[PDB]
Amino acid sequence: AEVARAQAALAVNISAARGLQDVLRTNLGPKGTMKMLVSGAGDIKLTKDGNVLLHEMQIQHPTASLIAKVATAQDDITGDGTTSNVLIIGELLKQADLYISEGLHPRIITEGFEAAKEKALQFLEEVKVSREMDRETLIDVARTSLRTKVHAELADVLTEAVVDSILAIKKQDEPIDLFMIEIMEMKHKSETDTSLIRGLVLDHGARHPDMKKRVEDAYILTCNVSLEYEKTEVNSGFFYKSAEEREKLVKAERKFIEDRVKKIIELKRKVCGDSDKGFVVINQKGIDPFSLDALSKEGIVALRRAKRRNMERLTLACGGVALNSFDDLSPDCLGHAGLVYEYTLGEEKFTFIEKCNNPRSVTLLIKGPNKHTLTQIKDAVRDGLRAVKNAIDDGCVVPGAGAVEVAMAEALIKHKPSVKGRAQLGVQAFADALLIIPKVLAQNSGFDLQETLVKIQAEHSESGQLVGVDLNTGEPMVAAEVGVWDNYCVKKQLLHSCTVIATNILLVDEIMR
Amino acid sequence: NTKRESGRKVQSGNINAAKTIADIIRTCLGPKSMMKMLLDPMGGIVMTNDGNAILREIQVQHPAAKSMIEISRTQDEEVGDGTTSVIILAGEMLSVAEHFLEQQMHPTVVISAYRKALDDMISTLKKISIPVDISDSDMMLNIINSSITTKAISRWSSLACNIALDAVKMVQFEENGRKEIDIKKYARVEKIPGGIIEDSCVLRGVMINKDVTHPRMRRYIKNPRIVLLDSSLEYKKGESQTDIEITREEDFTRILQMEEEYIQQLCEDIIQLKPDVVITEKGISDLAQHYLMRANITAIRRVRKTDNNRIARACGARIVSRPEELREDDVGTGAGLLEIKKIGDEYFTFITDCKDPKACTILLRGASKEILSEVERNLQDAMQVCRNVLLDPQLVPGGGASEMAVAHALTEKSKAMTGVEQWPYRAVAQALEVIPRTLIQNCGASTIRLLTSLRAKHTQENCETWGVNGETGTLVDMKELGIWEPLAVKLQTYKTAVETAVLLLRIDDIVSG
Amino acid sequence: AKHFSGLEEAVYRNIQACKELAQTTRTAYGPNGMNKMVINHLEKLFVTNDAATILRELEVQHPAAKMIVMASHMQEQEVGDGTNFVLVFAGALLELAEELLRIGLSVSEVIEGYEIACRKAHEILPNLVCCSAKNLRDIDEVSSLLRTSIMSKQYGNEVFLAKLIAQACVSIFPDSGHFNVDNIRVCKILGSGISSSSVLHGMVFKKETEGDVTSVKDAKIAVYSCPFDGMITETKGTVLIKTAEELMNFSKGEENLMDAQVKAIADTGANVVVTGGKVADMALHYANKYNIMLVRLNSKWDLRRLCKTVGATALPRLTPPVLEEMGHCDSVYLSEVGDTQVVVFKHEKEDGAISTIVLRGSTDNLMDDIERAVDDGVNTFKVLTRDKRLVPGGGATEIELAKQITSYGETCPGLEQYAIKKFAEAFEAIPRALAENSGVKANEVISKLYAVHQEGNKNVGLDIEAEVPAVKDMLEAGILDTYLGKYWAIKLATNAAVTVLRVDQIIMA
């Protein structure tokens, strides 16, 4: 058919990106906002985080495909910077644009970049200082990594709970939290909130006065497939070989229910000795009223509807083995939660599996009556969880609020890449994308992304001072004192995911449809 | 029917499709490259330095857009590389030649300038080609690692070549080391999914992924008995046809199991004897092969007799109809290494067959199965230059300085040839020199003054040997710089290049039927 | 489209979406409200006062407002007066940013303005509580708040629905120190007057009362959505007129096919049967023979209301029902609920928590407009029980807050200086709403409500007094909202506003 070539294909590329990018620039720091997102489903989503906006919907361009790619990098590889990663490239693109606006090769200006990124990486090592993984040292990173991602006040209460979650570790040291994430969204009088609740929490537990709400000594038979069949890890018919056989099973189906409670009432006394130790069958389907009562009446807690995750985290948490049957099991495999506690909050029971024998799994209780509030608060958590988890995995920490970038753009002082000056321009180009965080904020916040940053620049050129645009009012300060300190996992990776995709479009002279 | 097609229109569209396909690909060429990014009609973007990958996946058109991929594929299979050259070469010669010469109005003298330019190209190449050691993998390295960096990947320059270096030397033919003709079933590469380059090494021999696929099969038994069919497992696998009933529905299930029950006896007579290896070219059915795996008889299947014959002798064997029937005795082992590596659950049997025609299926690994491929894609071109240094120890230095080395040598023959043919033979000459110019205009500045300095350099300093740097543009020595354009690969791209343009010359006319 | 770009979602959509939802309240809030007819997919005219009632049937495309309708439903369940207020309040709050948008103040900036000020305002709300009152029993005293909360939500009898729902909410309970979701349900019944409405505590089936009367004291039901044509486990009977001889066998069989039913009904036990489905000719005549009460052909309304109040659950089939499927009521009896003779249960401590206010009139919309009221009489009374605090009737507290939050703007200075000034402005559209229903300018209201400059009582409501805008004391008028009402109505209108006020363009493929 047709194609596009020369700078015509290039113009479509570089324009579509920076046409999409500044749309995303509306949000960063706390002075960013929460961008309304409605995908084909019709749900409104408000996110200052990149991955949501990037991976849901896009104004469709050939560039819109690569942007989520390196967006699939930042959140994956780090989780802090998804908001920050986008704003870097087009600021660098408009720079390089100038050089090819002058006219030049996108190839020679390509070679003018990555060294500067490699430089800044060096410079990032240089300017940063390794910092404590201490809880309160994390806070200044925690708020910021959250706050660069999501708005302050949410990030502020998240600063507490996220650190409380990432400090909950057994010293399983990760960039993210897999197990520390157990999210319980609850309809509540609090529309945006997250409650930290330790230990594995079960999707539900069953009510009955004889059924113990408090199990401190738990022998947990994980229970999935219901009372209604004998020794069955899956519910299926023992009958229905003809038309009238349909009636016979349900006539004999109530038998297995009593057979099954018979197993559990004895398996308690088998394993637990007397009934003082609550024998825990968490029945991940509904417990039939008779055995619901008769397990209650025997002291067994028959818990209604845990999760497959609450089955696997149980295998983790309780240090015991799960099962898909209620069958009598050897007392060994039965899980032990140092606390099995059914917790009715609102009308809903959330059964704590606590004293996790592997407390890498904790639980967050999310709050809202309105899902649009309840979704958004859930969203701000986890992108900041792994962000602040990049705080406590990192003994190195990089000070935020433009402290380190003026330590690059100025210390990139040119003719160090003197050869063609294309690097001297490319590093200059790269130097100019560094300050987008000092830019976007003094942009979003008061004064000017420029007239404040000149102080930042100046005040950094002053006394080598760590200095930066406020995340809040957009005025100069000392960013080291403020404590705004970016994850050491962000900075390096934040650079890589930029210049690698910033390299591609330059070498792309061609597009065809 | 009344139809006719006139003159230039096809020729134009030829020249049109000729140069356009050449454009991005020739800018994707060289140490300074570009990228050709397709945008699918569906919205998917496809970015590849190889337009052959781009064009086949996008609209392919009746003009030379049909005739470029054919000669690319013609350039794909033989040596294995030059894939991007022919279309940038054929698009190069046709334009500059035809129009001016069709403005001089003649097809015929244009046709001859090709064969004219063919020999001088052969001449100054074979002259200024530099013989490099066939038995020195280092003297191989600098010439072979040059052809890896050519397209998208310098990653496997060392590694693929290293794995390619000795293997190809350790290959032979039916006509004999490997050398001579192009046979790439002696170049073979089979992937090890996942794995690591450290688990990888040089396998100078062949692997059969299907030799040992299970721990049950013969493993590490180093005097193999490979058996070709004919008695133990006969040519005929057909049904036993016992108690068959056409009037019974149960017999339909019987006849399919009955195929393998006779095959059961086929692999059972393998058990009754146990030649440690069994090969079947029509393949063995599983039910019989389970019994093979009971007897520790490695079951070779879905790899050819010729393949196995080349592998058998090269791993050693005595073939029999059945081990109780000895046709004649052959050597027990032809290989020094019988190795079965397990990555995934799959067992990969690597039998190094040293100085053997074999199949030469060489062990190679990337960090994952995907970059595993770029071992091979480089290995191929590496084994290409491995067989090339064996084929043609003499192979040119150049950054495309060969493309000048011919053109001025053309011109200085053209000046010596005179005639009207001077002009085509020169109009063919100046074509060649845009290819390296695009490499060194990607570098920058005045690439003409470079070509000035080049054609200054040409008779002054050297032509192709003392060359132009594809990453720089200055006059250098590509041998000293370690960059090498393989003689065969050079000439071969041109043999393929000259013809398609002659076809496009021949065609002013097509039909719809 | 629900997908948008071009800053509409920021500087346009919200202020458009709000007054759409709102400006019912502006004529629907205050000492009365002016009903607004709604038609549904079913064609009929539904007059509306409560904000969440007109918006419930209003189906919005607005990505903006879908946040706020919930807040009204939140506000509704909470208190029930002020849901109107919530829409018109946020009507003032958001639009003032347009100026600060023209003035150039950023998004979070002025939002922090209303926020710290609605934090500042929520701080003052307990201070601006003006007296208090309650009785866990008394109709009249409690009626006045339940009167004045439904004032906005009712143009109709203020005192009469005051006294009923006060009775209802109270006298369904042994305490009414506890108050719950359904403590009152309604049998909407026409005839006589709309002020003939009566509070009868129990489950009314306005449906037929059939079967021979067997029990009065025993109201225990085995509740069934199962029709009785003979529907029972072994043979599920229906009424089939297909042939005459098969009908002859039905009457024979049904007497027995109905036998094992009302048996199994009274086996598991009851003398009163709730049949959510049909009961056949010989099926009912056997209930006449069996001596059980079949309350037949009920609605899903009369089915669920019982299933809600007695905790039991209808059976679509007939299996012996459990006690989970069988509720008990104080007494089953035939009495007129607002002069309507059917089966009306009694509910206090057996299962309970249903008063029946019979909603009345000459049409259903009159029963829907008194539905508007007592729903808040339900809601506000819970607040009243939760807090007996009384706070100046809507708009009389505003003039207080505006003065306070005004100079609070000059305690602010910095871009929230004006946004708090604007938040001091965010209060005052409420009496404007009141005066705009009255049609008069609040500009006269404002100055007079500022005349004395305290604002503890003075307001201009919905009157013929307001016809020339005239300060009245909603405090003294008996118009006193509840603190939580005054707290909730500010909170979510500020909450749902700030979250929809940071929205950006919709991204869509």
From Swiss-Prot, chain A:
Segments forming a coiled coil: none
Taxonomy, superkingdom: Eukaryota
Binding site for ADP: 29, 81-84, 148-149, 401, 486
Alphabetized UniProt keyword annotations: Acetylation, ATP-binding, Chaperone, Cytoplasm, Hydrolase, Isopeptide bond, Nucleotide-binding, Phosphoprotein, Ubl conjugation
EC number per UniProt: 3.6.1.-
Gene Ontology terms: biological process: chaperone mediated protein folding independent of cofactor; chaperone-mediated protein folding; positive regulation of establishment of protein localization to telomere; positive regulation of protein localization to Cajal body; positive regulation of telomerase RNA localization to Cajal body; positive regulation of telomere maintenance via telomerase; protein folding; protein stabilization
One Pfam family, short name: Cpn60_TCP1
Compartmental location: Cytoplasm
Enzyme category, top tier: hydrolase
GO CC, alphabetical: chaperonin-containing T-complex; cytoplasm; cytosol; extracellular exosome; microtubule
Residues carrying N6-acetyllysine: 189, 277, 355, 367, 378
Phosphoserine modifications at: 195
Molecular function GO labels: ATP binding; ATP hydrolysis activity; ATP-dependent protein folding chaperone; protein folding chaperone; RNA binding; unfolded protein binding; WD40-repeat domain binding
Covalent cross-link Glycyl lysine isopeptide (Lys-Gly) (interchain with G-Cter in SUMO2) as placed by the record, residue numbers: 241
Similarity-based family: Belongs to the TCP-1 chaperonin family.
NCBIfam families xrefs: chap_CCT_zeta, thermosome_beta
Function according to Swiss-Prot or TrEMBL: Component of the chaperonin-containing T-complex (TRiC), a molecular chaperone complex that assists the folding of actin, tubulin and other proteins upon ATP hydrolysis. The TRiC complex mediates the folding of WRAP53/TCAB1, thereby regulating telomere maintenance.
Disease in which the protein is involved: De novo genetic variants in nearly every subunit of the TRiC complex, including CCT6A, have been found in individuals with a broad spectrum of brain malformations, and clinical phenotypes ranging from mild to severe epilepsy, developmental delay, intellectual disability, ataxia, and other features of cerebral malfunction.
The name this protein goes by in its record: T-complex protein 1 subunit zeta
Species classification: Eukaryota, Metazoa, Chordata, Craniata, Vertebrata
Gene: CCT6A
UniProtKB/Swiss-Prot annotation, chain B:
Residue positions, PTM N6-acetyllysine: 210
Binding site for ADP: 30, 82-85, 150-151, 399, 470-471, 485, 490
Keywords from the UniProt entry: Acetylation, ATP-binding, Chaperone, Cytoplasm, Disease variant, Disulfide bond, Hydrolase, Intellectual disability, Isopeptide bond, Nucleotide-binding, Phosphoprotein, Ubl conjugation
GO molecular-function terms, A-Z: ATP binding; ATP hydrolysis activity; ATP-dependent protein folding chaperone; protein folding chaperone; RNA binding; unfolded protein binding
InterPro entries, sorted: Chap_CCT_gamma, Chaperone_TCP-1, Chaperonin_TCP-1_CS, Cpn60/GroEL/TCP-1, GroEL-like_apical_dom_sf, GROEL-like_equatorial_sf, TCP-1-like_intermed_sf, TCP-1_chaperonin
Keyword Glycoprotein in annotation: no
Enzyme class: hydrolase
Record localization: Cytoplasm
UniProt EC number: 3.6.1.-
Gene Ontology terms: cellular component: cell body; chaperonin-containing T-complex; cytoskeleton; cytosol; extracellular exosome; microtubule; zona pellucida receptor complex
One of the protein's GO biological processes: positive regulation of telomere maintenance via telomerase
Catalytic activity, as annotated: ATP + H2O = ADP + phosphate + H(+)
Disulfide bonds: 354-360
Main location per the UniProt record: cytoplasm
Task of the protein: Component of the chaperonin-containing T-complex (TRiC), a molecular chaperone complex that assists the folding of actin, tubulin and other proteins upon ATP hydrolysis. The TRiC complex mediates the folding of WRAP53/TCAB1, thereby regulating telomere maintenance. As part of the TRiC complex may play a role in the assembly of BBSome, a complex involved in ciliogenesis regulating transports vesicles to the cilia.
Pathology linked to this chain's protein: Neurodevelopmental disorder with speech or visual impairment and brain hypomyelination: An autosomal dominant disorder characterized by global developmental delay, impaired intellectual development, poor or absent speech, and brain abnormalities including hypomyelination, cerebellar atrophy, and optic nerve atrophy. Some patients have severe visual impairment, dystonic movements, and seizures.
UniProt name for this protein: T-complex protein 1 subunit gamma
UniProt gene name: CCT3
From Swiss-Prot, chain C:
Recorded family membership: Belongs to the TCP-1 chaperonin family.
Modified residue annotations for Phosphotyrosine: 12, 487
One protein family per Pfam: Cpn60_TCP1
Keywords: Acetylation, ATP-binding, Cell projection, Chaperone, Cilium, Cytoplasm, Cytoskeleton, Hydrolase, Isopeptide bond, Nucleotide-binding, Phosphoprotein, Ubl conjugation
Positions of crosslink type Glycyl lysine isopeptide (Lys-Gly) (interchain with G-Cter in SUMO1): 441
Native organism: Homo sapiens
InterPro entries membership: Chap_CCT_theta (IPR012721), Chaperone_TCP-1 (IPR017998), Chaperonin_TCP-1_CS (IPR002194), Cpn60/GroEL/TCP-1 (IPR002423), GroEL-like_apical_dom_sf (IPR027409), GROEL-like_equatorial_sf (IPR027413), TCP-1-like_intermed_sf (IPR027410)
Subcellular location: Cytoplasm; Cytoplasm, Cytoskeleton, Microtubule organizing center, Centrosome; Cytoplasm, Cytoskeleton, Cilium basal body
EC number: 3.6.1.-
Function text: Component of the chaperonin-containing T-complex (TRiC), a molecular chaperone complex that assists the folding of actin, tubulin and other proteins upon ATP hydrolysis. The TRiC complex mediates the folding of WRAP53/TCAB1, thereby regulating telomere maintenance. As part of the TRiC complex may play a role in the assembly of BBSome, a complex involved in ciliogenesis regulating transports vesicles to the cilia.
Binding site for ADP: 29-30, 82-85, 151-153, 394, 481
One of the GO biological process terms: positive regulation of telomere maintenance via telomerase
CDD domains: TCP1_theta
Disease connection: De novo genetic variants in nearly every subunit of the TRiC complex, including CCT8, have been found in individuals with a broad spectrum of brain malformations, and clinical phenotypes ranging from mild to severe epilepsy, developmental delay, intellectual disability, ataxia, and other features of cerebral malfunction.
Gene of this entry: CCT8
Sites where the protein binds ATP: 82-84, 152-153, 394, 481, 486
Cross-link (Glycyl lysine isopeptide (Lys-Gly) (interchain with G-Cter in SUMO2)): 206, 236, 242
Protein name per its UniProtKB record: T-complex protein 1 subunit theta
Residues annotated for Mg(2+) binding in this entry: 81
